[PDB]
Design a protein around this nucleic acid. Sequence first.
RNA 1: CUGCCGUAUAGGCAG
Length: 181
Amino acid sequence: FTMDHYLDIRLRPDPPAQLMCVLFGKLHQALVAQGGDRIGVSFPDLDESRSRLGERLRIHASADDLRALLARPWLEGLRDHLQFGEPAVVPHPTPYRQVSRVQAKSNPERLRRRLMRRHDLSEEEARKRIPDLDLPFVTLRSQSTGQHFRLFIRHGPLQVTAEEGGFTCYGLSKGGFVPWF
RNA sequence: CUGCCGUAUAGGCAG
């Protein structure tokens, strides 16, 4: 399994939820800049039982990809509000799990607008057809339109072996799993 | 939130 290195970043007091969002956004910028699909995240102090991500962000990658990511100054500026481990090989063996963005059909009105574009119906028709998530999340800003949105994250069932797939520019699964420990 | 894929009131996705 090739994404066998990691770095833990822990939040330092100041508020925690807001700080994690800034950190996660900075990571996104860095991933977009690098353009790859082989850097993953997990939240090892997760409390799914309270929809809390916890205060530890773990970054997962090959040795070379982690080194390249960390070489960029994407953290300087936040550095004083973070505490760092050392980039390291993961323990082994460990289970693996998938850390995924989850989306839902949470707004029927938006569905109706699309359905109207796709079937030339009217709102009353659409409203008849399409009548009126409990996960941790980060709140991000849509850099193109300045709209804030919640990105909900699921840590899936543990399993014994890994996967071949990659990751998005938020570090979330596009098929890939990360070691869980 | 806004949009994309899909006949979908199927299942996904983008920022």
